[model samples]
Target chain A: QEQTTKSRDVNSFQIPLRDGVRELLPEDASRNRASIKSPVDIWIGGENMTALNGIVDGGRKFEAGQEFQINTFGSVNYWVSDEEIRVFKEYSARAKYAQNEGRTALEANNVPFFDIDVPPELDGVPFSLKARVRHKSKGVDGLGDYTSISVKPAFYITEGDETTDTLIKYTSYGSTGSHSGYDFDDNTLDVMVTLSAGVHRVFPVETELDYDAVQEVQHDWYDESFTTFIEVYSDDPLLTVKGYAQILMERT
Target chain B: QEQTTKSRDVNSFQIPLRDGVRELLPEDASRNRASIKSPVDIWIGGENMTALNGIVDGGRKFEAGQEFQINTFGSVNYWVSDEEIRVFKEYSARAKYAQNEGRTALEANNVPFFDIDVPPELDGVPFSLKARVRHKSKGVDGLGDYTSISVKPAFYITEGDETTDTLIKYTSYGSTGSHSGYDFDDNTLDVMVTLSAGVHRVFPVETELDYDAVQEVQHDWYDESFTTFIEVYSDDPLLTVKGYAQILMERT
Candidate 1:
């Protein structure tokens, strides 16, 4: 006997990267080191979610006009060599002085944006942007780059199908279907302000959420919130940069 | 009474489309029609899952070296005016003759790359590429666009935490973490070859898996694969081009 097979009819929208990979660099002065003053803006669904009040508390609540403090943390591992130790000592003394003077954490003052270097071929090509952190473990001898750092960067999206009670909707503008009301902006997401060896940290230690209110605005099309971290630890100092890239969809 | 809050620690990788919007156009020769000779390769996770054998059967299996035929379908709706009906007839007749000649479904010969017009401020910025289909319903008199396209695009990634016994890993090369092997090539991912009127349509269909094999070689730094679609339709004939952009994270 012959049998017929059937599958459910499915419909979807997709974004496929075409070709080439791009890199986003840090501000000139911040290259190869952390930037304190020029904090990167993480946009969520096109809106700012990084302000002290914009952060979602432990209870998953987000109410306008709420005031709070953002506590940052950091640490350092064994000095790779005498040179590294000396540099750390000098840097620490300077940082302490800056703190005592009530200055902002790190002294970077450039506008917060990815410094990407687009090549000629990809110049006229459309592209998407991404921010990534590379954690290279410092070598004990300080002579080579090794892959052995313990601490990782903690990253999160504050609003989506998962985090808050906010509803995400797509509206048609001309031929474009964009998120209604909100467009991309700083405070869209949050990043770790401090880096430490072998430690996990959370931003905005305080929290609150009204569970009953959140359940009301949920939608089937809503995608859940997610968390991703810098997993590979290398033998170099922590670095953050913009990955300028050409999206490609290719078969192996 | 005291209230307790609970949340889950989720680890996942995602592909979010950053700044700028891009478009893919149909061949002028086939203006607002379908092409058989120019069927686009749909690569998923760096693999060509477009062939007949590349498609999974009911038992949910994908083996190398399998071969099969791929059949495509399309439909149309009401014409807003007599002009639309006339155009539709002409397009249909031309497509039918091309089909009888035993050519591929789509007839695009131009190289499959995006033609993006990047602005100065966006220069040196990295970006991701995406292919999208817009199916807008024609007005009753065929005079305006509506939101009634039905058949939508079906897109998903193959071989990840969700499917297959295989594992994909990225290694740090300098400051870049790249795939263990494979890179971009044709047959990377699929696109719509036919754009019929009236009936909304989406292409590149079929998809699966949470596997232990995925976890074995998985470093704590594994990149999670995600799938999302362009959820909008337009009334005009299919237009393809490049979309330059920035990535943003915002709360809905």
Candidate 2:
């Protein structure tokens, strides 16, 4: 019988943001309204204002110097429970309906939605407030040829305090173990975590995301070793990052 | 009779650094201690000149070439009401000790703590100061087989103004949504907040750190996406790319 193959009790923490800020606030005492901790997804693209020089049947084309922006901005506050905060729980998704009867005849469209949840205890309540951003582009021409941008407020979680308890904090950098990109050669990162004594928990450090730069120079600059460091203490162990990058150490 | 089911009044806001900038210092008076805008966590990890290669039977063993540095750097500056300037409400973690030995032993230990409650003002003030890093390793007949490394000050946090905001803004790139590996794909990110609109109340955009690249290529490339496109006339909108990336738009 293929039974309980993996331990289901394992708790997983997600990286809120590679690098950003997150604040926590409780319901207001005067207004009684909860804070706006939600996510947003936006896409800014439109048909080029300039005329195309060739391939008249090529649909809408953006020339070398052409730029477009589509503004889809608004606020809609929603609530979520603590259990829903750990993952990017989806709330909704809708297909862009079409009539095929207009002048520009709706060639393409972008569908964007957002959802969020937060660590309870943060606001002294059963659920932490949160938000997220999401956007999708499509039409007669596959996905929109425009750029997609998403953003959200950043926050972190900890099982307990560090000075008094054992906690785990983690952060990662670079694409590979090789030193070809920035500093230190591949597989050359040496990391360590300190506790009161005796091993507290099972901490395995691994690389989740690799550094991918849009430009070659970016690859050269950010290509280094990535490490996730965790500290264990208080309640269980909190995973967090100190900083993101480390330089080569040489004996002087 | 049962009490009112819920508190009639409560306000809420979320924190924005899941894991995390720059410049050392500026004038204090001219800018007023405001630029410092509370606290930031920094990590400074380098090598120490020490050697050890043995099995001292202390339960911890180390091989000659093994080195480690586990440094967790950060700062927290709590203030009272916008009136308090910089400080907190109290500093303690008592109740945690009674139940557990690791609890109380860790309890009195947690005493070495810093708790600050910022004013709900001052950019939202008071609670705006904070900072972490972590790592681990294995080996040995018992435990400590080598060195631990930790670093800080690689970044910082600030307040007010994109020209001067205590916001720590950062961004990264990747494709997959999996917990392992990196690079491009789709619907793979969670983000928040827009650049325009209302005060958004507690919009605490702090400057907690930066990915200071070892090469100049880092700046030139990331400089492309910095855009501020707000809808026109408060309702309608105008779209534009700050630096512009168009080659990827062609269908052919």
Candidate 3:
């Protein structure tokens, strides 16, 4: 074991310096050390069941605010065809837990807005923005009780401004089917997740819906040090989903 | 409790529809409420570090331009054997501050590279590829120098023409101790960080090395977006390792 304490004898160098191989000269260790940066950890999801006080438009259409300005094949306005909509806190949170994940969640029977601000430190830093929710459907009514009504909700990543383009969406952009951040499988259904360029995240989904969208940033995308917008949208018109969203940044 | 909005009495709605909870919508909150987009963020380990100036790699096996690419199962024309491994980075400068991370970190012994690219929104959309480096290794001296090595670096959505495949390697699907993305233990001394899918990173090695390969892709395992390849073979490849590797994506 004396060899364990032995210093590195450069006189005899092998491919991999063995254990008890050698010690370092502060400069050597210092010079040899990689100056890894600190990781950026920021969050804004996991609604607190007690921190809120209400819902939006019952999450329905009549009380619906405005139509979403979609940017497919140029600029187009997609109307809210749903009969009713509302945004409120929902029951049951994602079973999956991470350091930043919390219990309790938000349930918007319709469009729920997420106003996210980009910390100046995270400018251009790649990371994933994700949402977690437990999904279930309220069927139209099977003669005896109910007919299955599909309510597959998808997340939308657009500008937080009143009018903006949908930078990331579900059906378009050559993006095929639903993908998963944690293995695309039968187990990962009902989850709507997204990865923005350099980062990734995973969370629970409602009733079992697994989805994903990847986004690469552009210097011209935004102010780099500003806020962006993310909203939930569904074509089913009468569909509803409840959950929360968060971001996962790349760290050194 | 009795005066809790005695007015919301359209006969009376139960649940959630309770008291003081009457309303919380703020001002032109509607008029000012808008959709916004988050700017483009960079990728993990994707940096154009100082390669030509200090990174060490033989002109032959390693490409001066792409430091992250590794050609395991050597090309008859390039590397003749596995004894002389490489992970190079010059003693350096210009560690870009406050925001972005540099790739010139000398954490790994031989030659280690990160293939990070700030793709030009590929046709106007942000679908750039990304990766997460969760590895641990360093070289001190051959003394107690290097012990074990386990690197499983995988970047998702591999879209470039980087040429990744185990669809080429020494092992034709060993069909044995196949590993998962869970962190590899410390003593396993040998492993590869392939890009059949994408991503990289390196670490120290131990005495006798073993030949192994792992792929992290999909059905076709080709053009399925994302790359996953790993290769390591040798008699006694000196190595050092600590942590395990994991990707947000479960590249099986």
Candidate 4:
């Protein structure tokens, strides 16, 4: 009997990269290695229960209000609505950062959008990747400083060598397919910073699920999806990023 | 509850590159893309399935009697094994396009092996990625001309773009995951090739499993994983590259 093979499209969203919630750094101050979401616990479908080490716990070890510098390799997906376009323009008057938002909006409406046909590459198969994290500083009026804009990759961020400068950066502005990012930031806030070695992640560290002990797990068996990390960034009791990356994926 | 975190050692084998695979004519032999399994894939717990679709099929379909090219990016990986050192040395011979099996044996034993700590940047993150693809040319005395070996990357390959030049060159040995090539003269063996555009791929496309009507399945979704493509270059059905990717998630 010949089995008719069927092909389907699959969307691969990495587990969330959780930024430990606590405090935002002062303007001009940035935190590097501030424990951005570990891309390990973040997975597509692994609910938080499947994690191997419980879930992400920021441990509340860091001081609050510190400008955390987020640097890693990965990507993001986003969406934007018509209303957001107008909101962005109106906000620009008082919000200087809104200027970047407006430009991003205009670009999203124009050249900034990515083309589905081409892969996001810098030079050849490898590319250079770099990201900086900044919290809206406490500025004038109730307007509040950057108040806390979540930082999630709007598209895919190809991983690369830390020493080498090849990183892959893409945009979602109007990406229509699975490989595309969203058009606007939408409900999600907080940049779940994901750090990968290269284009893809390594072995997974899933602590939530129950795998049969009898099954042979390999050395690189389970990779730690950034699930726990993202969860910690989400709703937490003791900690929170004034501006944080909304958790996507699962609660691992 | 005391949690015993199981950490598996994954090997991201470095594939090497060769002059032949790198320097190619536009049409002398309408085949030029190669790859090699990274030494690290051996260390991981699961198998990584790859797919390919490129000129190997569109140009002339991979035929057993044709000489095609194959190369890889600076990315490679493998499972962990004491035999890895043994296998690596043998891989080195094959990479040099060693026609003599005896030399292949001698060199295999002579190959050097070393281990590097998984970059701290890659710690705790869950997922699998191609650190690099070693390159090699397979020439079976009984088979066709040559089958270039390589791994699928999370990037795309355009026809002769100048940017990838400096990046795609060869220099490192098989120990470091360089790309290589060989001249196989098998007329009955078919060779396949593929070009991809992202870092991770989920297997068992969701539509196949979810079967959600109106869900508009996309190949590139937030956390979905799928193979790029599969192209068979051989006239023999069994000789084709067949398989798919897998993406599984567990919740806490």
Model-by-model lDDT, in order? 0.19, 0.20, 0.20, 0.20
Please give the lDDT score at residue B120 for candidate 2.
23
Is model 1 an incorrect, acceptable, medium or high docking prediction?
incorrect
Question: Per-residue lDDT for B1-252 in model 1, tens only?
Answer: 111122232222222112111111211211211111111121211111122332211111111222211111111110011121111111101000011111122113110111123333324333232223222223312312322222222322112222122211111111111112121211122232221122211112211111221243231111211111222122222222111122111111
Report the C-alpha lDDT of model 4 over A83-104, residue by residue, as the tens digit: 1111101111111111122222
> Order of all candidates by TM-score, from best down to worst?
3, 4, 1, 2
User: Taking the tens digit of each residue's C-alpha lDDT, what string does model 3 give over B11-129?
Assistant: 11111111111111111111211111112111111121112322212211111222111111111111112223322222121111010111222221122233322222212332212
Mind giving the per-residue lDDT tens digits that candidate 1 earns over A103-128? 11111221111112332222234332
Off by over 4 Å in 4: A1-156, A174-252, B1-79, B82-252
Q: Can you tell me which runs of candidate 3 are displaced by over 4 Å?
A: A1-110, A115-144, A159-163, A171-252, B1-252
User: How well docked is model 2, in DockQ terms?
Assistant: 0.01
Global fold similarity of model 1 (TM-score): 0.14
* TM of each candidate vs. truth: 0.14, 0.13, 0.18, 0.16
Query: Which candidate has the highest TM-score of all?
Result: 3
Candidate 2, residue B41: how far the Cα is off, in Å: 32
